[PDB]
Enzyme design. Sequence first.
Site: not given
Lengths: 136, 130, 136, 130
Positions: C9-10
């Site tokens: 995930v960013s």
Amino acid sequence: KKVAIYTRVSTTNQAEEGFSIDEQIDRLTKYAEAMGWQVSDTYTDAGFSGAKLERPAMQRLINDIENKAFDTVLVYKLDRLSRSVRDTLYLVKDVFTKNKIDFISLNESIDTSSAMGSLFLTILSAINEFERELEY
Amino acid sequence: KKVAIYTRVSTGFSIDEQIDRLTKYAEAMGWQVSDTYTDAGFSGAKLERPAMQRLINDIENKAFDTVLVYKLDRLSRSVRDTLYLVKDVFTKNKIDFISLNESIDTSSAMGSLFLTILSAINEFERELEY
Amino acid sequence: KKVAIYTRVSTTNQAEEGFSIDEQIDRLTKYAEAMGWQVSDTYTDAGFSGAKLERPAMQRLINDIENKAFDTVLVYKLDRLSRSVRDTLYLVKDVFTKNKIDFISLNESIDTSSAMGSLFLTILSAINEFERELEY
Amino acid sequence: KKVAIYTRVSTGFSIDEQIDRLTKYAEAMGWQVSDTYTDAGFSGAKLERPAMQRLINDIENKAFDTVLVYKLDRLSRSVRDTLYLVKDVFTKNKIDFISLNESIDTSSAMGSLFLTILSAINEFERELEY
């Protein structure tokens, strides 16, 4: 660039063939010369099926491959080279490509020296193998 | 997804095993199975098979939006019939097709392209060889 | 069959991610287990862009590749692995395939051990090279 | 075939050479050139070019059924614009497209497939990278 032309007809009645030997040679020669190339020689099977590779001129062409006499094989239509997908994959992949000889089929605008011509071959081979596995 | 499971053996894997692998797969993906379609003891050479026909006739009902098989050759041993089914029967009716073993899913970009390439290449092959 | 799962995930706000680390792991684990496999370990990059390969867990995965700990790498969605076509071609072709490790992206139903998954890769590589040559 | 020849250089091969190779090719194939469309001193980055526009506007006239270029990048240096032109302008209007150097002919089975694959893959790439 030196180029070999391969031509074939099933029968010896040129008047009745869809595309006679002479029409094939004329188109291929005119094409090669527009492209700026030279025809190093002509392989002609007049009166032979495309169902098998056992034809005098085709055999000659395969034998002459290990001479570097030419670097491209030209046909007017793919079915002149062979009417078998398996034989075509063998010729173009394991005989021509393997010896650094490009193949052009004019009618189909397939040229194995191009990005899309080589990809076409890869795709034909992969799909043919996949089909054969499904049916067998 | 609401999925129809199609399984077949001729007279690979058993019916029970195909059903088991495909039910587990559907459940792991969060999908609902709408029905099972089983052809136990039929050739894949042709499409005339009772459960296959029930499946094709059930399209009009809209109880599923995906047909799921374990291996493509359960569906058919004919490239021509496979293309007819997948392209002209399932896709034509907005029904997706998944073959678990070949990892082919016509709702994906690459499953959809694969189907397009197989059709175009098969036609090219016919035209060369005919 | 032993399988490595890669998740990314960013950001570190799981509540606000489209698909959190936990949702990714759950789907991938449930999938691997339906398939009858075992997850040998989990590589997780929480709070890293997919624009570059310089991420701790990804680097770990690449390093662990020469251990034969697993023979498949699984991702939920291709963009979790990388958001660069060039980086993806490098990973899947020159890192995974080169070491006899298959790659599955669930959302895209791409599996490089399948005939159509490997052909997809060949096509992506050929077309990407062709595009780059056109634009450059 | 009745062919329109499109050539371009920015401010490879000269205009004269492109015209020469393509006229020789058309004549060797037995084709008639309907007109030449020359953009001498224009970027391929965008489609706003006088001869390109004249070509696109001349579609309605039906004086040609093929557009012929020496190399794809004469037509455009943009994959997106190339796809728009070839797919949505030429093909949409039953005009074939030939790029001599790439041996791409959208009237052939493989040229047509190539265009389909390029479109599907470009869209896949956009979706990954966007």
